[PDB]
Ligand binder design. Structure first.
Ligand SMILES: Nc1nc2c(ncn2[C@@H]2O[C@H](COP(=O)(O)OP(=O)(O)O)[C@@H](O)[C@H]2O)c(=O)[nH]1
Ligand SMILES: *C/C=C(/C)CC/C=C(\C)CCC=C(C)C
Length: 170
């Protein structure tokens, strides 16, 4: 089953470090296909890190149109990046013309000792949007698989609910 995952969020939150951790297992390509088993389903993940494409209107429009699920990433040490989440969610909702888009809120760099965003205010925001919240470190790999696999589960849920031989001569 093919799932198209898009990683969005402010410059510097660890969107690239997260994608590279998931794919290559350590801490210039945009889009990558990785094959994985999740809850016993054989999955082909098409993952776009939006770091390069975000600044181009037509690219942004296109990855929001074709994207099936969105990791919305902020850094727990960057309040501005937490405030930016609502802008990303509002763009994705407008481009899809939908209220029901698979999304996971991700608070990255949880390995840092220097937090400026309370877990509670992130938990409250996720609840207000009706979406899962995951704390990750691309550095230590904490929560990384959980964050991507949760988003696959959200796309799976969305498809589960979303759901003639003819004659040419006659
Ligand atoms: N300590 C720590 N640093 C991180 C983490 N993720 C990314 N970084 C660093 O933060 C910076 C921005 O990462 P990058 O993946 O390029 O950000 P992007 O612009 O969102 O792709 C880089 O210097 C990374 O090494 C993390 O989980 N913990
Ligand atoms: C759907 C209509 C047709 C253009 C073809 C109908 C088939 C014909 C004339 C012959 C069929 C042959 C047998 C039933 C033996």
């Amino acid at each position: 089953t093919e799932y198209k995952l898009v990683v969005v969020g402010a410059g510097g939150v660890g969107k690239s470090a997260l994608t590279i951790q998931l794919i290559q297992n350590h801490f210039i390509e945009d889009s990558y296909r990785k094959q994985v088993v999740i809850d016993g389903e054989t999955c082909l993940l098409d993952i776009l890190d939006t770091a390069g494409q975000e600044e181009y209107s037509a690219m942004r429009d296109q990855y929001m149109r074709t994207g099936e699920g969105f990791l919305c990433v902020f850094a727990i040490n960057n309040t501005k990046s937490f405030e930016d989440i609502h802008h990303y969610r509002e763009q994705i909702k407008r481009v899809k013309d939908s209220e029901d888009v698979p999304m996971v809120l991700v608070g990255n760099k949880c390995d840092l000792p220097s937090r400026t965003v309370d877990t509670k205010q992130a938990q409250d925001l996720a609840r207000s949007y009706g979406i899962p919240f995951i704390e990750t470190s691309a550095k230590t790999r904490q929560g990384v698989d959980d964050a991507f696999y949760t988003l696959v589960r959200e796309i799976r849920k969305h498809k589960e609910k979303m759901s003639k031989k003819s004659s040419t001569i006659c």
